[PDB]
Subunit: 300 residues, 4 copies
């Protein structure tokens, strides 16, 4: 009684660089795109008949083709267009998952103004989206996740951790002052697809950064909740936000062996291990949408 279960296939990490150059002031969209189709590909696995299978090579061609034919503004719209496109090309497909990450570029400063066609990478986190489209016509449903990854941030005070559970293996001293440093990975789910994607992203990003800096932290857990709840309070169109934050320990070096004090000044920035504190903040009044999250961050 051995059968094929869940499966998906597509092209991973299609790097597409789109330039808008209708005026001498160029704009760039720098994208990394994943496609994944789902549906009746059973025979392709069990017997090797590829009749239903649209090659991943073609899914890559389609990314580049539509980059010209449809354009690339907000990555959520581009992902939605790709999802609907593959459903129209692949009758055996029941759904498509399109994930995109965008690398931001600034203009190189020349004599106090940004150059028309010279750019430098901004380097402060990746804007992401994960779009799922299922069905066709009146039964078509779609879900949009957006997110930020590798947003590297730190507080040098305003961070405490005390009153925790102490067991026989606990050696950690309580503290009222420590560094809190992380590299934030977050994704949030929109209630519908009728959203000003760029406006909401800029506001969410600003809210997460501001809350991180200004909330007095009693634990990374409490910081993440304050960040996520501030986002949902400001954005009724967002159903839920998941946050994943390493606690990149900066250890206060003991300089007493060298005859020196260390009043919170000299730290060893440790690579591994790191705390990993992960939390979701949700609207209690809307249904969950597990289809939006299937195979996020990955299949297995």
């Amino acid at each position: 009684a051995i059968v094929l279960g869940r499966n998906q296939y597509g092209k991973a990490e299609v790097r597409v660089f789109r330039v808008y150059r209708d005026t001498p002031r160029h704009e760039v969209r720098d994208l990394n795109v994943w496609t994944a189709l789902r549906g009746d590909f059973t025979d392709a696995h069990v017997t090797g008949d590829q009749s239903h299978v649209l090659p991943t090579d073609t899914q890559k061609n389609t990314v580049y083709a539509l980059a010209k034919k449809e354009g690339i503004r907000a990555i959520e719209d581009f992902a939605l267009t790709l999802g609907d496109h593959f459903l129209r090309q692949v009758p055996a497909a029941t759904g498509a998952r399109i994930a995109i990450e965008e690398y931001a570029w600034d203009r190189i400063d020349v004599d106090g103004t940004g150059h028309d066609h010279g750019f430098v990478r901004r380097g402060q986190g990746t804007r992401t989206t994960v779009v799922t489209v299922e069905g066709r016509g009146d039964e078509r449903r779609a879900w949009v996740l957006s997110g930020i990854s590798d947003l590297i941030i730190a507080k040098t005070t305003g961070s405490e951790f005390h009153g925790f559970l102490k067991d026989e293996y606990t050696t950690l001293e309580e503290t009222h002052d420590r560094i809190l440093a992380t590299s934030l990975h977050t994704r949030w789910r929109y209630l519908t697809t009728d959203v000003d994607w760029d406006k909401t992203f800029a506001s969410v990003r600003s809210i997460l950064l501001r809350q991180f800096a200004t909330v007095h932290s009693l634990a990374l857990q409490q910081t993440l909740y304050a960040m996520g709840s501030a986002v949902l309070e400001a954005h009724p169109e967002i159903a839920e936000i998941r946050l994943s934050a390493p606690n990149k320990h900066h250890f206060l070096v003991d300089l007493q062996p060298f005859g020196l004090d260390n009043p919170g000044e000299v730290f060893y920035a440790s690579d591994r291990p790191y705390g990993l504190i992960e939390a979701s903040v949700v609207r209690d009044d809307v249904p969950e949408a597990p289809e939006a999250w299937l195979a996020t961050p990955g299949f297995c």
Copy 2:
């Protein structure tokens, strides 16, 4: 109505290196360990009261302590032991997810025999486990996933891909002979925890490699199914197996511009993009265990 939803926390990437040295012939266990606790940590997020929280630093200490107290044989047993231990130490916790990677070492060859205490990394893929323990006493349940990651394999013939769906964006030529190269990521779920972990792991690994080599491939999809089904047929104790394989494209380089033939000999190994083909092989007569897979491969 904004509330804390799913959450977990713990120590990530604890590198523990355990030496067995009861005799001059030492053995090594080289591990990377993640802990993650789930339970009633709501107050720790919402008000900042850490009374329920066993610090991630303590969870790190526990890995090293139990590596001596309990030893490290099969990583599945060590992960099961850590899971039960944390539930004993943290009353608010309802469950624990313990994930481990093991890096295999061989003995250095000296006059045709492995040296007593000198080793070299084996380098052929990581052995993995993901162990979840929920509840205590009679209500306790546990699940074991084991797996292999970064197993880099290739066939230089016995691979085809033809008769696929062709649309207006398709330029891929059908082929009856190509390279098939991948880096296998796989995880499988055991029906129970009464398993000879090392014997089954070694068998699964050899079935995967043997099926990959000897099965004539009509598509990566079909190779993955053939590998997965053979594992399930040889191991009734395994409920399901998920395979994730990039199709690392080796393009036959066009040498005609240089006055040369290229009959399947000279290839360009492209990095990105790559096909990503993902399949699940399951026993239809056993129920699913979503608990085993929760937050695998990640939380969000």
Copy 3:
């Protein structure tokens, strides 16, 4: 006739995070430090007598100790202080090489102003230094290299490549318009150590960026020369600059198979292979200083 040749040893990648907090407006210095000592360590290699050897563990302790005792302003001064320090502690040492890289942080924007103690990584290249100190007292000599690494930049026009040598293996079409994208690695050597390190670095960085953007490029070779010569013309205190630039090819995708034009708009950003164009611009009137560059970028 087998003897020990050149050798050096020290601690690599000491991550030191220094916080200045005498006022509530904190400042951060985020550093990665390499030490390497040179001298009479022959017996330590040949017979294993470690009498001359100061442990790398101590060289690490010394980084953290001096971070408090001497402070960390410009990384060149900190590296010079470390070099002279190790010569005073290690009588067998004849020289010391201290390399440092600095990761820049900005203040998180809160209500239009930078927060007192909350920061985000700037993410636009690494400031580097390589300081070599040899001898003691009146025979002491020192050399300072500074540099930038991983400065990711791109032009979307103003870049040509034509009139090159065409041989029987050449398939490249000449072009008067292409993308030129790179990740710049550069190091330059100062004539003396009497330099305002921070002021010169900011000006050099600005000159390299401006020249990249504004010079009409006939080849990456010609761009790198225009960048390096502009730096030396503006900075008589700099003896030479070496630049190493990958040509990260952005290939104009052929969309004619899909019935579309591509007037310089849709590109495939290729990972590997990449051109690697490397050049030095030098003052013809000052002597070379090979001691400054020994074991840069590495020993072997």
Copy 4:
């Protein structure tokens, strides 16, 4: 008086995968190739006249073409062939540096015999070469470096470190038993180009591993010298060998706080910082060949 100084250019990281398939028992050569030309390319930098420049794209084409035309046996011979070829094609070039890494593959085991066309990556370090060719005809000279990179090895005893210099910043305890773990990077220079490259490589690798295992270590310094000298004593055709070894610290974890002993059994494998111990072993009766080492490991 600002002038162009040293420069070189070429194609970096050309991944060529060559299959030998004269019989059904295929063999594979899996290579990463760098080309770099040196010569009279001054005009190409200063005025932008590319007449002398053979495009890096052509240099890429030449790797694939000669992989068929000439074949790929030992990477040293292939690199020598590329070096001479470019000097034939590029009159302005005075020299070429060709560097290659090879990734070893094993045959997949099927019923105790290696499969005809199914392979798995060996995973134990990269075989390397760096070949420099200068001049043409009677004035031609060439040099071959071969090497090994990322060879991950460890001993769990037979390593000590005591009797070192102790200063006011030293806290390291002397020890008579510790783990010694490293990832070896080494390059050696052949006296001539009349060498059985594969036989010598295999011998050098086994001497390095065997000496590491069996030599009782008083310091990494002394282990490296013992490895290097043994290679030179067994291979008169090798002029010199440079070794670069991180001391990847495995700290004995203090388990006393948990009521436990730890007699050399449980270790924390730290990532950074790490000792970096670098030594050259040379024949004092042969002259140096700086030309062989120019821009190794990099240009700047």
